[PDB]
Design a protein around this ligand. Structure first.
Ligand SMILES: [Ca+2]
Ligand SMILES: [Ca+2]
Length: 274
């Protein structure tokens, strides 16, 4: 009755869960389209909304619920299972129904998250340009000790061109690319010098608005696997600082090829949480 997405076992979050670390007491903010708070396979603890006319606990798109599900779908006897099922999950709505947002909305969600003591911030969104405010916001958060993860882009590769977007491209943020069930790079995955790590993003099944489950493709599906891995590491080593968790993700990743296409490689959380 409970499904275990191929993604969980691939990054070895399952081996870590078995030792008893599931992310309990770790606070994760999901900056997205909101989350369908009423889904039986999710436990949303609070949040804020920076989008006019929509509250933070509804998702009229589905993208946000899906991401939330990869980080934390409940460990129970139904639906799916998240990377860090026991985390404290906040939904910060920065994107609208159609899936897009304004830089000031985003900057507001990023600062909300710093002021409210989030340990991990997930951003499965990106644009061609950043801003000085966006840059300030991510530098300070990370300087204040939060772990910031973003999706690199579903821009693919084209020549020697860098197709990573903002805020992934900022060096205070972990840019995440996507792989398939065979650990092969998905065709859509952005490339460039700022690519840091790879995670599952092709054919990812997760929670979906109106109490169901669905399969989606993207770096948006990949990023959450890393936010969640960050949270596992912290439930195991509370003592760690942000750049210590980060450096653990990249140092112990599985080598898959050139860094321009794969960063340091596929994440392995068992190795990282050593
Ligand atoms: Ca479940
Ligand atoms: Ca970066």
């Amino acid at each position: 009755a409970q499904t275990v997405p191929y993604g969980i076992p691939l990054i070895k979050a399952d081996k870590v869960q078995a030792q008893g670390f599931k992310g309990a007491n770790v606070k994760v903010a999901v900056l997205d389209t909101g989350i369908q708070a009423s889904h039986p396979d999710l436990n949303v603890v609070g949040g804020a909304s920076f989008v006019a006319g929509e509250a933070y606990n509804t998702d009229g798109n589905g993208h946000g619920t899906h991401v939330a599900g990869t980080v934390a779908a409940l460990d129970n006897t139904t639906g799916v299972l998240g990377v860090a099922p026991s985390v404290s999950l906040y939904a910060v709505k920065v994107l609208n129904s159609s899936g897009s947002g304004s830089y000031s909305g985003i900057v507001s969600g990023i600062e909300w998250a710093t002021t409210n003591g989030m340990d991990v911030i997930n951003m499965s969104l990106g644009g061609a340009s950043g801003s000085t405010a966006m840059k300030q916001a991510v530098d300070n958060a990370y300087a204040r000790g939060v772990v910031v993860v973003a999706a690199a882009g579903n821009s693919g590769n084209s020549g020697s061109t860098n197709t990573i977007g903002y805020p992934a491209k900022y060096d205070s943020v972990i840019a995440v690319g996507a792989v398939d069930s065979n650990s092969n790079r998905a065709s859509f995955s952005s490339v460039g010098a700022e690519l840091e790590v790879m995670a599952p993003g092709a054919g990812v099944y997760s929670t979906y608005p109106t109490n169901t489950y669905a399969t989606l493709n993207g770096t948006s599906m990949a990023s959450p696997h890393v936010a969640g891995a960050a949270a596992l590491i912290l439930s195991k080593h509370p003592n760690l600082s942000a750049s210590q968790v980060r450096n653990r993700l990249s140092s112990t990743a599985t080598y898959l090829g050139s860094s321009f296409y794969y960063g340091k490689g596929l994440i392995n959380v068992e190795a990282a949480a050593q």
